[PDB]
From a paper:
The focus of this investigation is on the ORF WP_011172736, which we demonstrate encodes for a 2-epimerase. Whereas the sugar 2-epimerases that function on [name]-GlcNAc have been the focus of past biochemical and structural analyses, this is the first detailed investigation of a 2-epimerase that specifically utilizes [name],[name],3-dideoxy-d-glucuronic acid as its substrate.
The next structure solved in this investigation was that of the WT enzyme crystallized in the presence of its substrate, [name]-GlcNAc3NAcA at pH 5.0 (structures 2 and 3). The model was refined at 1.8 Å resolution with an overall R-factor of 18.2%. The α-carbons for the two subunits superimpose with an RMSD of 0.8 Å. As observed for other 2-epimerases, there is a significant closure of the gap between the N- and C-terminal domains upon [name]-sugar binding as highlighted in Figure 5. The uracil ring is positioned into the active site by the backbone amide and carbonyl oxygen of Val 265 and a water molecule. The pyrophosphoryl moiety is surrounded by the side chains of Arg 12, His 208, and Ser 284. The pyranosyl moiety is anchored into the active site by the side chains of Gln 14, Lys 17, Asp 98, Glu 120, and Trp 307. In both subunits A and B, there is a chloride ion located within ∼3.2 Å of the side chain of Arg 12.
Author numbering:
A (entry chain A): 2 to 361
B (entry chain B): 1 to 41, 47 to 363
The structure:
Amino acid sequence: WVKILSVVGARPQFIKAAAVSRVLRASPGVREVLVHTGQHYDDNMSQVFFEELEIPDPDYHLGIGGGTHGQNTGRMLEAIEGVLLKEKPDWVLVYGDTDSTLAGALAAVKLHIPVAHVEAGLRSFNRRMPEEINRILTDHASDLLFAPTETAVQNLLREGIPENRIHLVGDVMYDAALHYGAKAERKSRILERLGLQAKGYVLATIHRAENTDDQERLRVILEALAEVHQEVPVVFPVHPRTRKRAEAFGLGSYLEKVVALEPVGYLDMVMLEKNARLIVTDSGGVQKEAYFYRVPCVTVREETEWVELLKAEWNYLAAPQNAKDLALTILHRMRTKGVEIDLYGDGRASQKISDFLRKV
Amino acid sequence: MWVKILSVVGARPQFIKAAAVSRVLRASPGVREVLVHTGQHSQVFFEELEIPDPDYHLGIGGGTHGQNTGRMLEAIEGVLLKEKPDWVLVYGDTDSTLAGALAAVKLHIPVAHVEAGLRSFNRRMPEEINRILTDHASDLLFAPTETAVQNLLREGIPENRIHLVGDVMYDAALHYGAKAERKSRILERLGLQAKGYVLATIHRAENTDDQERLRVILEALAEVHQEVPVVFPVHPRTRKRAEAFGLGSYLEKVVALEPVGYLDMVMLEKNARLIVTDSGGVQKEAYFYRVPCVTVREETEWVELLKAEWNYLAAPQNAKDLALTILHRMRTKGVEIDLYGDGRASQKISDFLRKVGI
Ligand SMILES: CC(=O)N[C@@H]1[C@@H](OP(=O)(O)OP(=O)(O)OC[C@H]2O[C@@H](n3ccc(=O)[nH]c3=O)[C@H](O)[C@@H]2O)O[C@H](C(=O)O)[C@@H](O)[C@@H]1NC(C)=O
Ligand SMILES: CC(=O)N[C@@H]1[C@@H](OP(=O)(O)OP(=O)(O)OC[C@H]2O[C@@H](n3ccc(=O)[nH]c3=O)[C@H](O)[C@@H]2O)O[C@H](C(=O)O)[C@@H](O)[C@@H]1NC(C)=O
Ligand SMILES: [Cl-]
Ligand SMILES: [Cl-]
Ligand SMILES: [Cl-]
């Protein structure tokens, strides 16, 4: 048998790990160990993902979070190593691009434990972004690089990573949407709770530091969504950090002018995404999900790593410079669509991953 | 024009590199330096380098990679938040190096890597990962060799961030040569004459943490000693391992010493017939003095020394074979060639740090 240990720190990593774990559980000589590093350690940011997505309780919860980059990363590196020394996994899988991701990779490679990066080779080319540093360092530390796009493959080849370590497997978050979609239909009643008609609202999520730590950007965003809301209802599950910033800068009243919610579980999120007329976000996962449901998307950033979405016209960049401009862009984009194209694979990225963790 | 340049150093070879750089930075009064020592607070060997005492001793060491690295990352960041330097300099390829780079980059403090782009292409070595990741985290890459330059370019690091400045350890050797000649009495003390001995240092974990591999080395040196005396300043950790494994009697069969200071090291190296080492710095220094070298490893990053035939790899598989290799190479010389720059790597580094821009 082979032991495959997964390190997960945050909501989007739990969702990626859910897809992979589902395939590895069904595999003959594979034992899974799951380490939760403690970054997201809430109900609506963590536990709801474990229950709804049928993820077995983590074997370890490290309880680390809320410090500086150096504190969080340093403590995680030591604590993850401690677990690796006990468990002696044959593979460590790390996901996405947070400090957890880097800490796991760095803990493993120094113990000569093979590392594979799920969602490898994404680049913003903005080296000041902490996650840009994280994915670069993770990718160079890894033994296997599971890229979701051709752009990701090209990015890894450009940095001298050898072709035989890189596999274009598609996106496990597509696997997740495809596999949990029926379940979301059979359990979520969020549209009824909120009194929404299918295709009678816009859905917004905003959590990037660039957008929430800069008062003028966050004011543009919140004023824009209030304007949009007068035309078409805006539903907004608000990230807790985003809520705290809006309150801190005196912008809380804008949340009261839309249908602002606390963060929702994945099943409700699927139902909201599926039924939205348009999605406005700065989330990586959410902009891909918009495309999964063929809902037009606006990404409130100067760039995205998911460039194929822009090229296929499913997604559109709108930097938050002016509230009225952003509102008008949102309104205009909601009656657009992109081209016919199949991105991110067949929904079996996870069994491709599993197969490679046998063969290599 | 007032800029603060903070240097992160772990062990001996990093102090020697940082000393070379700091001797040049001291010539710019608008440059304030801060020196952060990641280990504990000997103070003589320290002073031969003409460096002020460290501003900080974080006192981290003796654990696993994850412990040492994780503790250092958090402690270095703490200092950076206090000191708010304009530049962080990291040196070489240890866990201290990577911890300093990681601490800085996430605070948006520019990092320069002294000794950038070296590659073994074997990730069994922790230092390989360390230097790859440090390089990809760095704003300025100070490469010692053309090979290092080509390694950095192949990994997609842009040309305008890479500078071939040569090796600060050649600067150091050039700077301290005369003082060593004037002040060192080690040959007199040991009873050796020029070209009458072989010098050995061994400190790599892979060579000292396996009983039978360390036995191969110590037995080889005992055999060599029967033909030509072997002078062996033993790294303290090498001696601890040797004692723990029950191999200490082998140290009595050569001229085993405690670690020596830099000036005495210059004198030993310069006057040796052959140097046998697993040190990166000593490999180069053997070449500086045109003394043949045998590297007790499966690879070296300093590949120019192999091509110029000044160095030769002898993995420690068999005591007899390693001894014979050592004795055969003692009668060799490499080709005349100018590696590692003009002794002014440190000046080039300082020039780049001071003009790069905010
Ligand atoms: C630093 C950064 O922002 N890195 C990116 C970051 O992802 P994301 O931005 O997508 O974070 P999120 O938006 O918090 O979660 C979305 C999910 O929550 C669900 N979601 C959303 C809201 C909600 O209320 N309920 C939900 O279930 C949605 O349905 C989605 O399934 O972290 C990822 C990771 O480390 O794995 C990186 O892969 C990633 N990098 C890229 C390039 O996409
Ligand atoms: C992991 C590893 O072994 N990395 C390498 C490691 O250096 P080295 O192997 O040279 O360590 P050392 O041999 O302990 O010191 C030599 C000096 O001590 C003097 N030395 C020596 C013995 C003595 O008794 N007295 C002395 O004065 C000698 O005269 C020398 O000047 O750490 C360096 C660093 O991080 O900066 C890396 O750049 C380097 N990687 C390469 C590629 O060379
Ligand atoms: Cl969010
Ligand atoms: Cl289609
Ligand atoms: Cl040594």
